């Protein structure tokens, strides 16, 4: 709150812009002499004599400059004078430079030296250069110069393998190192907020012709540099700035502006450094006289040209493309007439080069007229090849007199000897007037006088008007001061910075102005900028003036609603109009106009008028002279121009229409105006489109999008779409149009019929081709009801057309529009990008759409091309048969009970777990307390995450221990992480203090059964408890449990939810058989339908407590921030600053958790938060302890970056970190030492920590399998929001959710409101049905139908039938659908040979079904095994086969991982045949080969390898079973060897010594071979700790002896049973489990005793066991005849290599 004054900006602004002079006088050098010709005044400024070298100045040969930089300098012997003074500064220092030189001084090679300096850092090994490690930006003021420089730098840097490209005219430019472009282009790019995607890699910025600061375009430069500098401060990344300027006053302020050290990087060269000394002639015209003004100019021109009439070149600059033809024509038109003036400057009156200029005449246009006589023309466009030919022919210095336009001076380098500029008057469309030419143009033009290698002295002449034009004299003689035009453009600039989020308020804006050139200029010339010496003395830093300017601009932006700004706080709030305004580069008055006139019902007439009213056009007016032509155009343009007579408005309208109709024009001012309106047209219309699209106005969205496309394609909607193909003849198309036939119908005609219909058969084939090149999409929909208000839509987009790289490029963009029945409203919309490589792949787009209870017949889904005209597909979505679900019952009302005390629990040993922490239970806990603690009946508690639902389950547990001391309780959590957290908490709370037994179920079965036996409290995930309790008939400990607790039961609606549902239903089923109730306690998030889950689990209406999300003990303040960006990387980057703003606004001093999509995003967001904080001049602001205190803990960290961020008070959490590291970060965060932690989404279940503020960065994650982004499960988000809960510390929790705009409303709905859930079990049926058939719970079809009655599914099917695709809620429909389900499931199971179906009723388990059910493996997996396995299968084939298991289907493919898997593919022993690298099976294969080969990989691949190796064993054992069941010897035992070598990480053929720890590839050389051989270990390297590991290895590794007998050798014979008895004994007590350090989940040894014939390759008998101490093994098999043959007895492990044994017998 500081005093603010409203300024009048029009008072402070410089009106003349570039034409403005701070100059009082102008001092003329040496000979000033004036010659008065009475028709004009002539002022001569002579050339400066060439300066002799100074004492230290010398030329610097290319050999002297650095080795790596010599390339690109071929063609240049040594450096230029200027460049020689600059070479050390450019190449050998990183200092910011400002180079002031005469125009044409060759400042270019200096910039190239700066570039080469940047390149020199990247030298690398023998990679030659690093293309992707850096980017360089070259900003040039003119487009022509941009292309010239792209060419030059391209040629010069070609040897370094570097791409130079032009950005000004859409992504893909990401592959380009040097981006050349205009200030406004780069400003537009860096405004986007995803700017960082471009600028993160930028190490260098070169501002060319920076004196443009004085020009009206200058503020753009100021904004650019300000933005970049603040970015140097904010990112801490150093970015070098090189300014290049003409020699003019104030340049030192430019150096300051650019952060240049005046004693280091500032270089100024006066006019004596001009490469060709210039004799200057300044002509000016006395009076305004009529039309003889022009004849005066031409008379001047003639007299001054003729002084050169032998070898000399003259270049004349004129202001119109017509004036080129008129002036070159005019001297030949004038002159000659008098004694053939200057005739034959064609050298020899014969044919020297005359034959060459007369031979090129066979060119076109007016070129042919002037060319035989040394003459030519250069003007803007309309020539082609001819412009080039004028250039090359003028270049060999034959064309003598060349008349041109400034575009030549800017576009290509061809200096002449003499340069004449005519009149200095140019038409300005934006001013709508005729004004005096821009300073930059004059400089670059006159800069062409004299030829560097061909001229000792140059000459130039500037003809102009007399008055107040001493200005030019000021300009060329280095006296014209550079000022700041910033005051003019201040509101649009300020708005841009507000939209980027760089200024959040007035103070930030003042500080922002501090970086502007305006600031310095105001400081050093205060009177000029309208500041009193008094004001300046009292306020040297100009706080008052900056604050006042900011105040005025803010009021302007606030008026037009680009920004909400309150004068009290001074804070800025971005609006959408401002956001679009900054993005689409529109002035604030125009956005306000649009805001006024835009409405859904706006007609097209009205639209064109609104476009005409854009303030970009405010100075355009209708001249008398153009009226007639306008009239003609209006008669020819299609859209009615409403009641506007010839106003500026109507003129603009018709000019745009005329541009679309491609009508040719004559009037030149009119042509200029049209170009001006059409350049802006696309942007303005795209802006309008964005406005109405995001307001959801369907008609106007349609109109506006079409208008964008029409301006782009220069055609009306009415015409034929084929026009959009540019290589097609236009009269063919007009013939097609003349036929009043639909374009669509052309799809169904063969090319014969095509050529036939058009009576032009010759084109018939080609047309056909293009017809099928036209983008076309097929649309398929799948509709699932969610709530009465909400529907789920799966939209399948199928491309139908041929892709062409020429036509479609790399991609094609579409808008998915979901509109209501009237097509007046867009209910949902999103951007869909079809990539070329991924075309022909099917695209599944999922979203939700709102509906309203008086349901319409249908909605409409239109997919419309973003570019192509008349490209669309519309699909009706029919509601006729739609059955909305039942509305949700009210939540259980939360009563305010007295906050029941801990003493209400009556036990002391119980109360001691609580009283220390809290005096009382919360309202939810007290309300449910009586029910849960006192009764035994089943109970459901719904409540938001963080309501403390946990200790209700704990009430129940305490009661179970109260009733029976030996009682057994099983607790299930969907997530393993949660399971371990609960395990820690309750191990302390029960096993330690209350001294009960607390166990945690693991992967392995046997040890788990044991844990089930001893445990009082048993913690498990659904899968473990599933593979356990499947055998429940046979396992008593499963049958008897007093208490069953399920937490987060709403996860039944998520992935893996079917298993939760199955085990819960099985527990209910079990409960009814023993008529001893198994109590069931279910905890959940607020459910829209509690009632269904309650009926399912046996909860009474009173024992069911389901609470609304607003009763959450810590009240939630939820804020949802939409971002409209369709490209995720860009969105994240645009989210970076809003995150920091969220921290500092909502939780400045209190803890903050920030969830981000991926591992890498954790580090990046942490670093952004860090550096931004520090750039607020507040560092450690997030560190609430002293750095000194942290050092002792941080000494234990391996990770460097984690140390640095923790040191700044910000930690982060991802899976790559060690448990120690994670625990460290969590402990520090909980303690309050660090205020901020940034965790990946995968850890949201695995974090025990809480915050005051939770920020969710984006909502989506990348799926590499489908090549698309997918939404966070609503469950993960619920969890994340729950992590901001702090009942003790905070009076409120706070959450800020950041997301793509299309998702925004979704989170406003299902966060605030309770969550509807459904059962996906019906798609998971097969494994469970197979399982229950094996255990004989299901013996027939009726048993399956009955089994289904225990599921949540059964309940939901009548509540939301259409979700499960039931067409009715009648009991008939239910029975029918269920029967259909069991029939299909059982059928699929029979076809897979898992089960056998008998008598159409009964079912029985088969072998494969038993195998799958036993090892807990998907049935398709073992089916696949049975199909792909044969007698000749070996190890490699086995790996390929096991890699294809369905268990590995969910192995993730991450972003940009295809390259890494491609690299891994060549590094592995078994090359894979035609692999797809987004295929998870290919990945698991490669990773298996990697694990075997001891390849260490990236962290991600390592975690993946872990998840694979997890399920590897059961898969392999399944292969063993299957192989033996088919009677194959060789493939078996190979499977076993594979099990071994998977456990111990070794290959087929390999050292057995590789199993011992602390062995490398170097050691084996001296080992020349068995753990059995281990005479002094002194053979090689030993450490006593390493000695401990090896000695520990050998006392475990099996030492086993085996006896065998064929019982009664002789009494067995012909046909009868044979029993081979084997006896196993080991000479050591087994200690510890298997040790396989490289195996993630340590397994226990098991052994196969196999009997088989090695000749016929038959496995006659097999058995698997665990040894214990010693073991008896009975192998029984049937005998062949003539009883005596040769057999083999194998003894194999699943773990170790080398323990394998063979015994031959008979
Ligand atoms: O962002 C999203 N994430 C999700 C996560 C998730 O788990 N599910 C499954 C699920 C959801 C709730 C309960 C249980 C299971 C679904 C989504 C869908 N979703 C989304 C995406 C695009 C658009 C959209 O508009 C919705 C909308 C718009 C306007 C008015 C009303 C609604 C929504």
From Swiss-Prot:
Membrane-spanning segments: none
UniProt enzyme class: hydrolase
Motif DEVH box per record, residues: 1047-1050
Result for mutant: residue 1137 to A: Decreases ATP-dependent RNA helicase activity
Domain Helicase C-terminal: 277-514, 1138-1346
Gene Ontology MF terms: ATP binding; ATP hydrolysis activity; helicase activity; identical protein binding; RNA binding; RNA helicase activity
Region (Interaction with TSSC4): 875-1706
Sites bearing Phosphotyrosine, chain numbering: 302
Annotated SEC63 domain residues: 574-879, 1405-1706
Catalytic activity from the UniProt record: ATP + H2O = ADP + phosphate + H(+)
Tissue: Widely expressed.
GO cellular component terms given for this protein: catalytic step 2 spliceosome; cilium; membrane; nucleoplasm; nucleus; plasma membrane; spliceosomal complex; U2-type catalytic step 1 spliceosome
Signal sequence, start to end: none
UniProt comment concerning the protein's domains: Contains two helicase domains. The N-terminal helicase domain has catalytic activity by itself, contrary to the C-terminal helicase domain that may have a regulatory role and enhance the activity of the first helicase domain.
Subunit structure: Component of a core complex containing at least PRPF8, SNRNP200, EFTUD2 and SNRNP40. Component of the U5 snRNP and U4/U6-U5 tri-snRNP complexes, building blocks of the spliceosome. Component of the U4/U6-U5 tri-snRNP complex composed of the U4, U6 and U5 snRNAs and at least PRPF3, PRPF4, PRPF6, PRPF8, PRPF31, SNRNP200, TXNL4A, SNRNP40, DDX23, CD2BP2, PPIH, SNU13, EFTUD2, SART1 and USP39. Component of precatalytic, catalytic and postcatalytic spliceosomal complexes. Component of the minor spliceosome, which splices U12-type introns.
Protein name as annotated: U5 small nuclear ribonucleoprotein 200 kDa helicase
Originating gene: SNRNP200
């Amino acid at each position: 709150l500081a005093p603010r004054q409203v300024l009048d900006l029009e008072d402070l602004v410089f009106t003349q812009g570039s034409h403005f002079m701070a100059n009082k006088r102008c001092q003329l050098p040496d000979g000033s002499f004036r010659r008065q010709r009475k028709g004009y005044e002539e002022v001569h400024v002579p050339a400066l004599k060439p300066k002799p070298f100074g004492s230290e100045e010398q030329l610097l040969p290319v050999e002297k400059l650095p080795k790596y930089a010599q390339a690109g300098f071929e063609g240049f012997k040594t450096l230029n004078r200027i460049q020689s003074k600059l070479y050390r500064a450019a190449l050998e220092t990183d200092e910011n430079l400002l180079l002031c030189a005469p125009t044409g001084a060759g400042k270019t090679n200096v910039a190239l030296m700066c570039m080469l300096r940047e390149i020199g850092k990247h030298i690398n090994m023998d990679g030659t250069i690093n293309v992707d490690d850096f980017k360089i930006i070259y900003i040039a003021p003119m487009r022509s110069l941009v292309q010239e420089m792209v060419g030059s730098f391209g040629k010069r840097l070609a040897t370094y393998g570097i791409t130079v490209a032009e950005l000004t005219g859409k992504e893909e430019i990401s592959a380009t190192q040097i981006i050349v472009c205009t200030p406004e282009k780069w400003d537009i790019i860096t405004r986007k907020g995803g700017e960082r995607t471009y600028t993160q890699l930028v190490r260098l910025i070169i501002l060319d012709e920076i004196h443009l600061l004085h020009d009206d375009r200058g503020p753009v430069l100021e904004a650019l540099v300000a933005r970049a500098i603040r970015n140097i401060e904010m990112t801490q990344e150093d970015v070098r700035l090189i300014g290049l300027s003409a020699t003019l006053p104030n340049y030192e302020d430019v150096a300051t502006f650019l952060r240049v050290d005046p004693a280091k990087g500032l270089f100024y060269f006066d006019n004596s450094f001009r490469p060709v000394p210039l004799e200057q002639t300044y002509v000016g015209i006395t009076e305004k006289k009529a039309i003889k003004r022009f004849q005066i100019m031409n008379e001047i021109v003639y007299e001054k040209i003729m002084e050169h009439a032998g070898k000399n070149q003259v270049l004349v600059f004129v202001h119109s493309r017509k004036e080129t033809g008129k002036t070159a024509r005019a001297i030949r038109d004038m002159c000659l007439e008098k004694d053939t003036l200057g005739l034959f400057l064609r050298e020899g009156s014969a044919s020297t080069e005359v034959l060459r200029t007369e031979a090129e005449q066979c060119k076109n246009l007016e070129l042919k007229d002037l060319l035989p006589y040394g003459f030519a023309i250069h003007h803007a466009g309309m020539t082609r090849v001819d412009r080039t030919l004028v250039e090359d022919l003028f270049a060999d210095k034959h064309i003598q007199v060349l008349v041109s336009t400034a575009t030549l001076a800017w576009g290509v380098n061809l200096p002449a000897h003499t340069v004449i500029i005519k009149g200095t008057q140019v038409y300005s469309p934006e001013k709508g007037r005729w004004t005096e030419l821009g300073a930059l143009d004059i400089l670059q033009m006159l800069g062409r006088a004299g030829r560097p290698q061909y001229d000792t002295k140059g000459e130039g002449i500037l003809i102009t008007s007399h008055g107040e034009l001493q200005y030019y004299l000021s300009l060329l003689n280095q006296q014209l001061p550079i000022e700041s035009q910033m005051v003019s453009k201040l509101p649009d600039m300020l708005n841009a910075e507000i939209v980027l989020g760089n200024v959040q308020n007035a103070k930030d804006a003042v500080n922002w102005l501090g970086y502007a050139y305006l600031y310095i200029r105001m400081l050093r010339s205060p009177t000029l900028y309208g500041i009193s010496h008094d004001d300046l003395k009292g306020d040297p830093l100009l706080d008052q003036r900056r604050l006042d300017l900011v105040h005025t601009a803010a009021l302007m932006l606030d008026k037009n609603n680009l920004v909400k700004y309150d004068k009290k706080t001074g804070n800025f709030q971005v609006t959408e109009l401002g956001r679009i305004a900054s993005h689409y580069y529109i002035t604030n008055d125009t956005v306000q106009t649009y805001n006024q006139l835009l409405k859904p019902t706006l007609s097209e007439i009205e639209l064109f008028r609104v476009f005409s009213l854009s303030s970009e056009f405010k100075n355009i007016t209708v001249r008398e002279e153009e009226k007639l032509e306008l009239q003609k155009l209006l008669e020819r343009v299609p859209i009615p121009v409403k009641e506007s007579i010839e106003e500026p408005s109507a003129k603009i309208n018709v000019l745009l229409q005329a541009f679309i109709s491609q009508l040719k024009l004559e009037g030149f001012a009119l042509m200029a105006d049209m170009v001006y309106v059409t350049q802006s047209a696309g942007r303005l219309m795209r802006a309008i489109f964005e406005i109405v699209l995001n307001r959801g106005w369907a008609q106007l969205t349609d109109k506006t999008l079409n208008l964008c496309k029409m301006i782009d394609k220069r055609m009306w909607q009415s015409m034929c779409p084929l026009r959009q193909f540019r290589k097609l003849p236009e009269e063919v198309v007009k013939k097609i149009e003349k036929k009043n036939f639909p374009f669509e119908r052309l799809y169904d005609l063969n090319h014969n019929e095509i050529g036939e219909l058009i009576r032009m058969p010759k084109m018939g084939k080609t047309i056909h081709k293009y017809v099928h090149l036209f983008p076309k999409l097929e649309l398929s929909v799948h509709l699932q009801p969610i709530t009465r208000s909400t529907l789920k839509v799966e939209l399948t987009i199928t491309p139908d057309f041929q892709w062409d790289e020429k036509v479609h490029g790399s991609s094609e963009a579409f808008w998915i529009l979901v509109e209501d029945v009237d097509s007046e409203v867009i209910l949902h919309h999103e951007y869909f990008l079809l990539k070329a490589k991924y075309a022909q792949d099917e695209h599944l787009i999922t979203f939700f759409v709102p509906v309203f209870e008086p349901l319409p017949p249908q909605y409409f889904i239109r997919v419309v091309s973003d570019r192509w005209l008349s490209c669309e597909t519309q699909l009706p979505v029919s509601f006729r048969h739609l059955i909305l679900p039942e509305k949700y019952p009210p939540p259980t009302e939360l009563l305010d009970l007295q906050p029941l005390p801990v003493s209400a629990l009556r036990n002391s040993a119980f109360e001691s777990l609580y009283q220390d922490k809290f005096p009382f239970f919360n309202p939810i806990q007290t309300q449910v307390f009586n029910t849960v603690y006192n009764s035994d009946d089943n109970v459901f508690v719904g409540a938001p995450t963080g309501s403390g639902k946990t200790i209700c389950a704990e009430f129940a547990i305490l009661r179970m221990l109260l009733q029976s001391s030996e009682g057994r309780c099983v607790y299930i959590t969907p997530m393993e992480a949660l399971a371990e957290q609960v395990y820690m908490d309750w191990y302390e709370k029960f096993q330690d203090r209350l001294n009960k037994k607390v166990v945690l179920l693991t992967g392995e079965t046997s040890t788990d059964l044991k844990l089930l036996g001893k445990g009082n409290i048993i913690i498990s995930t659904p899968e473990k408890w599933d593979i356990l309790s499947r055998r429940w008939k046979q396992r008593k400990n499963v049958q008897n449990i007093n208490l069953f607790v399920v937490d987060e039961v709403h996860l039944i609606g998520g992935e893996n939810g079917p298993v939760l549902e199955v085990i819960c239903s099985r527990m209910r089923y079990i409960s009814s058989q023993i008529e001893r109730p198994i109590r069931i306690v279910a905890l959940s998030s607020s459910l829209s339908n509690a009632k269904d889950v309650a009926h399912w689990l046996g909860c009474s209406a009173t024992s069911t407590f389901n609470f609304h999300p607003n009763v959450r003990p810590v009240p939630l303040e939820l804020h949802i921030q939409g971002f409209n960006i369709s490209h995720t990387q860009t969105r994240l980057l645009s989210m970076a600053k809003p995150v920091y703003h969220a921290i500092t606004k909502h939780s400045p001093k209190k803890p903050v958790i920030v969830f981000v999509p991926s591992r890498k995003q954790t580090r990046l967001t942490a670093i952004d938060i860090l550096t931004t904080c520090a750039a607020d001049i507040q560092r450690q602001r997030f560190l609430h302890c002293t750095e000194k205190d942290l050092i002792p803990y941080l000494e234990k960290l391996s990770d460097s970056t984690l140390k640095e961020t923790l040191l700044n008070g910000v930690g982060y959490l991802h899976e790559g970190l060690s448990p120690m590291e994670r625990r460290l970060v969590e402990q520090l965060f909980s303690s309050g030492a660090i205020q901020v932690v940034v965790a990946s989404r995968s850890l949201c279940w695995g974090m025990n920590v809480a915050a005051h503020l939770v920020i969710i960065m984006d909502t989506q994650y990348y799926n590499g399998k489908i090549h698309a982004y997918v939404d966070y499960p609503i469950y993960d988000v619920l969890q994340m929001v729950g992590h901001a809960n702090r009942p003790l510390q905070d009076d409120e929790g706070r959450c800020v959710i950041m997301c793509q705009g299309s998702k925004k409303d979704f989170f406003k709905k299902f966060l605030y409101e309770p969550l509807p859930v459904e059962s996906h079990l019906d798609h998971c049926m097969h494994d469970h049905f197979n399982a229950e058939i094996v255990t004989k719970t299901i013996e027939n079809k009726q048993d399956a139908v009955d089994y289904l009655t225990w599921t949540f599914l059964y309940r939901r099917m009548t509540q939301n039938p259409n979700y499960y695709n039931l067409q009715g809620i009648s009991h008939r429909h239910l029975s029918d659908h269920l029967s259909e389900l069991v029939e299909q499931t059982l059928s699929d199971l029979e076809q897979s040979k898992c089960i056998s179906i008998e008598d159409e009723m009964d079912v029985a388990p088969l072998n494969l079904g038993m195998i799958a059910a036993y090892y807990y493996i998907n049935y398709t997996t073992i089916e696949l095994f049975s199909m792909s396995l044969n007698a000749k299968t070996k190890v490699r084939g086995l790996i390929e086969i096991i890699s294809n298991a369905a268990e590995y289907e969910n192995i993730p493919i991450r972003h940009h991982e295809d390259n890494l898997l491609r690299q891994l593919a060549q590094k592995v022993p078994h090359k894979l045949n035609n692999p797809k690298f987004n295929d998870p099976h290919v990945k698991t294969n490669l990773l298996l080969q990697a694990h075997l080969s001891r390849m260490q990989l990236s962290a991600e691949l390592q975690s993946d390898t872990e998840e694979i190796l997890s399920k590897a064993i059961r898969l392999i054992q399944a292969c063993v079973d299957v192989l033996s069941s088919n009677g194959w010897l060789s493939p078996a035992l190979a499977a076993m060897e594979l099990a071994q070598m998977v456990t111990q990480a070794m290959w087929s053929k390999d050292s057995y010594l590789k199993q011992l720890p602390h062995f490398t590839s170097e050691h084996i050389k001296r080992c020349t071979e068995s753990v059995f051989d281990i005479e002094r270990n002194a053979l090689l390297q030993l450490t006593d700790s390493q000695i401990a590991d090896v000695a520990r290895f050998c006392n475990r590794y099996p030492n086993i002896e085996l006896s065998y007998e064929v019982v009664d050798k002789d009494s067995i014979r012909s046909g009868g049973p044979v029993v081979v008895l084997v006896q196993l004994e080991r000479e050591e007590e087994v200690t510890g489990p298997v040790i396989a350090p490289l195996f993630p989940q340590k397994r226990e040894e098991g052994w196969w005793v196999v009997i088989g014939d090695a000749k016929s390759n038959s496995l006659i008998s097999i058995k698997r066991l665990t040894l214990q101490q010693k073991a008896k093994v009975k192998l029984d098999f049937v005998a062949p005849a003539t009883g005596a043959h040769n057999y083999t007895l194998y003894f194999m492990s699943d773990a170790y290599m080398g323990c394998d044994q063979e015994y031959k017998f008979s």
